[PDB]
Amino acid sequence: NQPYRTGFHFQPPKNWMNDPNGPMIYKGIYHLFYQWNPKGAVWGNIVWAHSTSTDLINWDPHPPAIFPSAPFDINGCWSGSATILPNGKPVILYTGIDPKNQQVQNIAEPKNLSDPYLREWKKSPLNPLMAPDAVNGINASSFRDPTTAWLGQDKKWRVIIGSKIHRRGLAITYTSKDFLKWEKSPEPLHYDDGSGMWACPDFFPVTRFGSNGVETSSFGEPNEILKHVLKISLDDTKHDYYTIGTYDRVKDKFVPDNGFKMDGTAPRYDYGKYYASKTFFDSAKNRRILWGWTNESSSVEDDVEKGWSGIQTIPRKIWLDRSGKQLIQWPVREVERLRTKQVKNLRNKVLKSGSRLEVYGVTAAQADVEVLFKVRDLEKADVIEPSWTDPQLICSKMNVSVKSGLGPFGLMVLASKNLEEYTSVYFRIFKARQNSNKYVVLMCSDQSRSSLKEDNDKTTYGAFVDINPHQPLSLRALIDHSVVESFGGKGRACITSRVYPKLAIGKSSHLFAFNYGYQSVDVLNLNAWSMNSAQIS
Ligand SMILES: *[C@@H]1O[C@H](CO)[C@@H](O[C@@H]2O[C@H](CO)[C@@H](O[C@@H]3O[C@H](CO[C@H]4O[C@H](CO)[C@@H](O)[C@H](O[C@H]5O[C@H](CO)[C@@H](O)[C@H](O)[C@@H]5O)[C@@H]4O)[C@@H](O)[C@H](O)[C@@H]3O)[C@H](O)[C@H]2NC(C)=O)[C@H](O)[C@H]1NC(C)=O
Ligand SMILES: *[C@@H]1O[C@H](CO)[C@@H](O[C@@H]2O[C@H](CO)[C@@H](O)[C@H](O)[C@H]2NC(C)=O)[C@H](O)[C@H]1NC(C)=O
Numbered sequence: 001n002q003p004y005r006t007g008f009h010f011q012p013p014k015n016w017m018n019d020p021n022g023p024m025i026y027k028g029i030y031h032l033f034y035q036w037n038p039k040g041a042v043w044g045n046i047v048w049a050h051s052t053s054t055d056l057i058n059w060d061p062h063p064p065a066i067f068p069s070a071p072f073d074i075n076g077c078w079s080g081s082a083t084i085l086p087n088g089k090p091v092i093l094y095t096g097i098d099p100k101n102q103q104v105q106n107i108a109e110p111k112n113l114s115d116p117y118l119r120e121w122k123k124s125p126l127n128p129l130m131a132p133d134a135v136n137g138i139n140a141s142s143f144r145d146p147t148t149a150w151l152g153q154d155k156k157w158r159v160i161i162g163s164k165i166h167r168r169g170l171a172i173t174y175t176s177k178d179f180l181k182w183e184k185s186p187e188p189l190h191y192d193d194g195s196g197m198w199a200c201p202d203f204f205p206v207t208r209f210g211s212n213g214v215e216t217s218s219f220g221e222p223n224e225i226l227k228h229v230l231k232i233s234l235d236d237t238k239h240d241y242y243t244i245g246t247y248d249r250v251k252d253k254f255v256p257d258n259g260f261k262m263d264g265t266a267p268r269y270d271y272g273k274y275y276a277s278k279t280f281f282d283s284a285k286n287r288r289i290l291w292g293w294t295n296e297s298s299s300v301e302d303d304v305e306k307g308w309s310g311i312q313t314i315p316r317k318i319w320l321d322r323s324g325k326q327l328i329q330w331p332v333r334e335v336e337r338l339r340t341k342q343v344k345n346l347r348n349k350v351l352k353s354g355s356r357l358e359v360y361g362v363t364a365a366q367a368d369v370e371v372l373f374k375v376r377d378l379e380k381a382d383v384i385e386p387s388w389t390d391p392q393l394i395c396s397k398m399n400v401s402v403k404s405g406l407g408p409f410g411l412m413v414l415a416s417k418n419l420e421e422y423t424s425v426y427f428r429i430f431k432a433r434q435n436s437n438k439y440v441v442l443m444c445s446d447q448s449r450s451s452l453k454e455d456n457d458k459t460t461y462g463a464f465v466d467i468n469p470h471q472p473l474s475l476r477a478l479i480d481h482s483v484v485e486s487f488g489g490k491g492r493a494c495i496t497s498r499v500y501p502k503l504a505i506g507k508s509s510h511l512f513a514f515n516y517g518y519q520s521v522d523v524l525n526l527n528a529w530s531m532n533s534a535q536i537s
């Protein structure tokens with residue numbers, strides 16, 4: 001049986017899944033391709049598997065669209081993106097592995113534009129459109145993951161491909177005026193020395209104030225003020241980072257805001273298990289949607305034993321925060337449809353020092369839970385230790401057993417009856433070292449005690465939240481058997497973790513709200529929703 005298969009998260013019926021590939025919307029239908037091993041629970045024989053939806057939650061299967069069948073992709077069909085041409089026509093640019101094991105860029109387009117499921121795709125015998133050679137001097141073994149392409153104000157298409165040269169990450173930009181003949185621009189859009197391979201790049205605009213998404217090609221109105229986000233997947237650190245800045249269309253370079261740097265010190269989308277992110281414009285609801293890949297935290301032996309590996313996070317809506325400092329993410333509202341009509345609700349309850357409160361009457365391994373925490377006296381908070389800068393290091397140096405003035409308080413999810421197994425998601429509040437009344441809010445996802453099985457990835461994840469602890473603290477968790485997605489400060493901080501409990505499964509799982517800090521905290525409001533399964537394949 002399968003106690004770790006997700007109820008409502010996207011995953012194939014069996015075996016290895018990888019990056020999300022070319023997400024898009026065509027003729028009112030959502031499309032999601034992905035890297036898949038059609039015959040193994042490890043990486044290998046990789047092809048573009050294909051599924052579709054009308055709500056981004058329930059998915060219908062289709063035979064693999066892009067698979068090795070030609071010289072330009074004979075040894076593999078790696079990640080890529082989908083562009084929607086101004087005439088509504090969709091195209092895919094993807095990385096193929098050639099007879100010499102070189103990473104080359106191939107175009108593919110639909111065979112029957114009237115088929116709204118876009119079942120079969122044809123490849124141009126002119127592929128590769130973009131390839132390494134002796135004159136460009138591009139590293140043949142690191143030249144992959146082409147982005148969604150944008151059209152500039154000089155009627156020329158621009159697209160970037162992630163690469164590297166001697167420990168220098170760079171986003172190589174190409175230009176075309178017909179989307180068939182692509183010439184390499186003399187200089188990259190951006191680069192960074194020190195950070196390794198610049199995998200899964202992404203480049204998209206956002207409005208300075210608003211929740212609504214922006215079309216990729218858009219220059220905006222004469223009244224609408226725009227900023228740009230460059231996102232990259234660092235292969236060295238295995239994380240996804242982004243910076244916010246301005247797109248100099250003259251010099252064709254990306255200039256990050258004052259303070260940002262495009263390396264391992266940039267903001268992340270998710271401070272847990274989260275890789276190879278890709279966005280697309282959803283013209284139906286005028287929103288930008290983020291897809292992310294979460295790989296398995298269990299041993300490889302366990303993966304082949306259960307016969308599958310890798311799930312996809314429930315899609316997030318993304319926009320720019322009012323303060324302009326960071327991006328905000330929130331699970332697409334369609335997921336809220338899976339909530340049972342019945343809803344367990346608790347309000348105005350006081351968790352005193354070293355206390356717990358079980359949430360009764362919910363399917364505790366497949367649920368959605370939202371908490372509001374009110375702190376009583378803010379000057380009871382401890383002052384942050386001078387050289388405490390890495391939020392992940394705070395959460396691992398001091399577990400739930402080590403107490404602060406304020407914190408740990410939050411949720412204990414996927415928990416056994418007598419608490420032999422629990423995954424804790426909590427807050428800690430410190431005073432900042434500054435002269436003013438500034439506070440540091442910490443959000444941890446501790447999975448050191450998450451499973452009795454010894455050889456699982458027990459790594460603890462951590463993040464700072466940009467919220468004011470004068471106001472009530474917001475925490476949300478989507479729980480799905482082996483995956484939990486934690487959301488702090490209304491999507492200002494996101495943590496995904498993977499848990500494989502030996503006791504806390506299905507009927508036997510529990511849910512707790514807790515507090516181990518010196519001072520008691522108020523639970524202003526608490527709502528738990530049992531979650532229905534989704535029709536995915
Ligand atoms: C796909 O999934 C696999 C499996 O889940 C992923 O591979 C594993 O990745 C994780 C990291 O994400 C690694 O697991 C552990 O790594 C930890 C590294 O040790 C540090 O952990 C904390 C900070 O990161 C911190 O508590 C600790 O500090 C202590 O030591 C420091 C000196 O090093 C120093 O600051 C102090 O002395 C302090 O006491 C460490 O810095 C750790 O928990 C374990 O060591 C463990 O290795 C593994 O490397 C990976 N496991 C495998 C299977 O290789 C993989 O990333 C995923 N891939 C993708 C694409 O997402
Ligand atoms: C081009 O990229 C390849 C692939 O990363 C580099 O070769 C790797 O070098 C690293 C050393 O850090 C080692 O892991 C292996 O020796 C190589 N990996 C594989 C699987 O090929 C190569 O050094 C790069 N060359 C240049 C000039 O940038």
Ligand SMILES: OC[C@H]1O[C@@](CO)(O[C@H]2O[C@H](CO)[C@@H](O)[C@H](O)[C@H]2O)[C@@H](O)[C@@H]1O
Pocket residue numbers: 018019035046078079080095144145199200235275276
């Ligand atoms: O399917 C390959 C696809 O995955 C990415 C990012 O997840 O890279 C992974 O696979 C590469 C080839 O095996 C590895 O070099 C790399 O370490 C790993 O992250 C994309 O780069 C690629 O398109």
Ligand SMILES: *[C@@H]1O[C@H](CO)[C@@H](O)[C@H](O)[C@H]1NC(C)=O
Pocket residue numbers: 112113114115
């Ligand atoms: C394309 O798909 C449409 C709609 O499903 C179908 O009617 C038609 O036969 C296909 N086009 C051709 C002529 O192959």
Ligand code: NA
Pocket residue numbers: 081082083091092093146147148149
């Ligand atoms: Na594209």
Ligand code: NA
Pocket residue numbers: 287317331332333334
């Ligand atoms: Na939404």
Ligand SMILES: [Zn+2]
Pocket residue numbers: 058059060
């Ligand atoms: Zn359907």
Ligand SMILES: [Zn+2]
Pocket residue numbers: 019020079080145200201276277278
């Ligand atoms: Zn990609």
Ligand SMILES: [Zn+2]
Pocket residue numbers: 237239
């Ligand atoms: Zn790391």
Ligand SMILES: [Zn+2]
Pocket residue numbers: 385386
């Ligand atoms: Zn000290």
